[PDB]
């Protein structure tokens, strides 16, 4: 069902609604599964020390079906979109904490329960079908990680036991950066799906 140009509140729901309905995928439309969302790997540099690298593998992320689109601005002369969200993400994956300057690494599992608030911005333009029908075309966006709330992080006990036995923010800052990096991959994926719906439906569809 269409919105009426201008009504920002109408949109957020259409999107949330799109995200939930399609969130497990639809290959033929290039709509990616985003709940659960799988990230093959993601690397993260310690902000307080570039010799320290967190290597995530197999991140499995749930929660994105349900995120709220709590703010939605479409500017028509500049043709750009600002939008804010919150997701409660449950994250699980393999982790390798790599201390490059010490020639060692520690391995195990990682789990993070966090509520993330962010901002996606992109511009867009109008463009035609082969039949001359107009679609929106959404352009490469940027993602700003506005906050991560107060995360719960757990390390598998083999790892946390290895860490303790070795040392027997940077913290804050490192924990923050990992969540933001992960949130960022999450939203590259969200917007991919927004971008994809825009290919699947005439611009006319999205407003009255
Ligand atoms: Zn794609
Ligand atoms: Zn909502
Ligand atoms: Zn939770
Ligand atoms: Zn078309």
Numbering used by the authors: 7 to 174, 183 to 222
Paper text:
The uptake and release of JH are regulated by the opening and closing of the α1-helix over the JH-binding pocket that functions as a gate sensing the ligand entry.
The crystal structure of B. mori JHBP in complex with MPD was solved at a resolution of 2.6 Å by a single-wavelength anomalous dispersion (SAD) method using selenomethionine (SeMet)-substituted crystals. The refined model contains four JHBP monomers (A, B, C and D) in the crystal asymmetric unit, which are related by 222 point group symmetry. MPD1 is anchored in the cage by a direct hydrogen bond of the O2H group of MPD with the hydroxyl group of Tyr128 which forms a direct hydrogen bond with the epoxy oxygen of JH in the JHBP-JH II complex. In addition, MPD1 is further stabilized by CH-π stacking interactions between two methyl groups attached to C2 of MPD and the aromatic side chains of Tyr130 and Phe142. MPD2 is partially solvent-exposed, and is held in the cavity by a water-mediated hydrogen-bond network with Tyr116 OηH and Arg189 CO, and hydrophobic interactions with Ile60 and Phe62 in β2a, Ile101 in β3, Tyr116 in β4, Ile159 and Leu161 in β5c, and Leu185, Leu189, Arg189 and Ala192 at the N-terminus of helix α3. The α3-helix has no kink in its conformation in the MPD-bound second cavity, but is kinked at position 190 near the N-terminus in the unliganded second cavity, where the side chain of Leu188 occupies the same space as MPD2 in the MPD-bound structure.
